[PDB]
Amino acid sequence: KVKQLADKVEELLSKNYHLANEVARLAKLVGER
Amino acid sequence: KVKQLADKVEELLSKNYHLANEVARLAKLV
Amino acid sequence: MKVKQLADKVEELLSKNYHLANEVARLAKLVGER
Amino acid sequence: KVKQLADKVEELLSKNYHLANEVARLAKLVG
């Protein structure tokens, strides 16, 4: 069903956006001087 | 459109898997 | 002197690591963009 | 004091190597 799949796409776009921000946050912690 | 959305989900799940792996990898570098 | 050479190398590597980490962050945001 | 600074250089080199590898890994995910 389109609605269910559309909701799953939205959820994953959001989750991936936030996980990518976490990669960035951790990278800056590793690089801290 | 169901077909296209299903393919999009498979692609996004792969991106999610890779991003979670990179979070893990960087945490270990801290 | 050896101490000075190494202290300079430490500063150089701190800089390179800081910039590489910023590049990791930049690329992560590209991957994550919606 | 040389021993100490050399040890710090080694740790920073290790970090540098892994950070460069992370740049490579992420660049592959842009596609």
UniProtKB/Swiss-Prot annotation, chain C:
Compartments in which it is found: Nucleus
Disulphide bridges: none
Coiled-coil annotated spans: none
Effect of deleting the gene: Abolishes recruitment of the mediator complex to the upstream activating sequence (UAS) of amino-acid starvation responsive genes. Decreases RNA level of genes involved in amino acid biosynthesis and cofactor biosynthesis during amino acid starvation or methyl methanesulfonate stress. Growth dependent on amino acid supplementation. Sensitive to amino acid starvation. Sensitive to purine starvation. Decreases cellular glycogen levels during glucose starvation.
Induction: Translation is induced by amino acid or purine starvation, or during growth in low or poor carbon sources. Translational repression during nutrient-rich conditions is dependent on four uORFs (upstream open reading frames) present in the 5'-UTR of the mRNA; these promote ribosome dissociation. Translational induction occurs in conditions reducing translation machinery efficiency, leading to ribosomes scanning over the uORFs, and increased translation of the mRNA. The rapid translational induction is followed by transcriptional induction at later time-points, independently of the uORF sequences.
Stretch list, region Leucine-zipper: 6-27
Transmembrane segments: none
PTM: Phosphorylated by the cyclin-CDK PCL5-PHO85.
Cited function: Master transcriptional regulator that mediates the response to amino acid starvation. Binds variations of the DNA sequence 5'-ATGA[CG]TCAT-3' in canonical nucleosome-depleted 5'-positioned promoters, and also within coding sequences and 3' non-coding regions. During nutrient starvation (low or poor amino acid, carbon or purine sources), it activates genes required for amino acid biosynthesis and transport, autophagy, cofactor biosynthesis and transport, mitochondrial transport, and additional downstream transcription factors.
Record-stated family: Belongs to the bZIP family. GCN4 subfamily.
Subunit structure: Homodimer. Each subunit binds overlapping and non-identical half-sites that flank the central CG base-pair in the pseudo-palindromic motif 5'-ATGA[CG]TCAT-3'. Interacts with the mediator tail; the interaction with GAL11/MED15 is direct. Interacts with the SAGA histone acetyltransferase complex. Interacts with the SWI/SNF chromatin remodeling complex.
Domain observations: Residues 89 to 100 and 106 to 125 define the N-terminal activation domain (NTAD) and the central acidic activation domain (CAAD) respectively, which can function independently to promote high-level transcription of the target genes.
Name of the featured protein: General control transcription factor GCN4
Organism placement in taxonomy: Eukaryota, Fungi, Dikarya, Ascomycota, Saccharomycotina
Gene (name only): GCN4
Swiss-Prot record, chain D:
Domain of life: Eukaryota
Region (Leucine-zipper): 5-26
Subcellular location field: Nucleus
Phenotype seen when the gene is deleted: Abolishes recruitment of the mediator complex to the upstream activating sequence (UAS) of amino-acid starvation responsive genes. Decreases RNA level of genes involved in amino acid biosynthesis and cofactor biosynthesis during amino acid starvation or methyl methanesulfonate stress. Growth dependent on amino acid supplementation. Sensitive to amino acid starvation. Sensitive to purine starvation. Decreases cellular glycogen levels during glucose starvation.
Conditions for induction: Translation is induced by amino acid or purine starvation, or during growth in low or poor carbon sources. Translational repression during nutrient-rich conditions is dependent on four uORFs (upstream open reading frames) present in the 5'-UTR of the mRNA; these promote ribosome dissociation. Translational induction occurs in conditions reducing translation machinery efficiency, leading to ribosomes scanning over the uORFs, and increased translation of the mRNA. The rapid translational induction is followed by transcriptional induction at later time-points, independently of the uORF sequences.
Post-translational events: Phosphorylated by the cyclin-CDK PCL5-PHO85.
Record family assignment: Belongs to the bZIP family. GCN4 subfamily.
Entry function: Master transcriptional regulator that mediates the response to amino acid starvation. Binds variations of the DNA sequence 5'-ATGA[CG]TCAT-3' in canonical nucleosome-depleted 5'-positioned promoters, and also within coding sequences and 3' non-coding regions. During nutrient starvation (low or poor amino acid, carbon or purine sources), it activates genes required for amino acid biosynthesis and transport, autophagy, cofactor biosynthesis and transport, mitochondrial transport, and additional downstream transcription factors.
Domain notes: Residues 89 to 100 and 106 to 125 define the N-terminal activation domain (NTAD) and the central acidic activation domain (CAAD) respectively, which can function independently to promote high-level transcription of the target genes.
Subunit structure: Homodimer. Each subunit binds overlapping and non-identical half-sites that flank the central CG base-pair in the pseudo-palindromic motif 5'-ATGA[CG]TCAT-3'. Interacts with the mediator tail; the interaction with GAL11/MED15 is direct. Interacts with the SAGA histone acetyltransferase complex. Interacts with the SWI/SNF chromatin remodeling complex.
Name of the protein in its database record: General control transcription factor GCN4
Residues of the full protein shown: 251 to 279 of 281
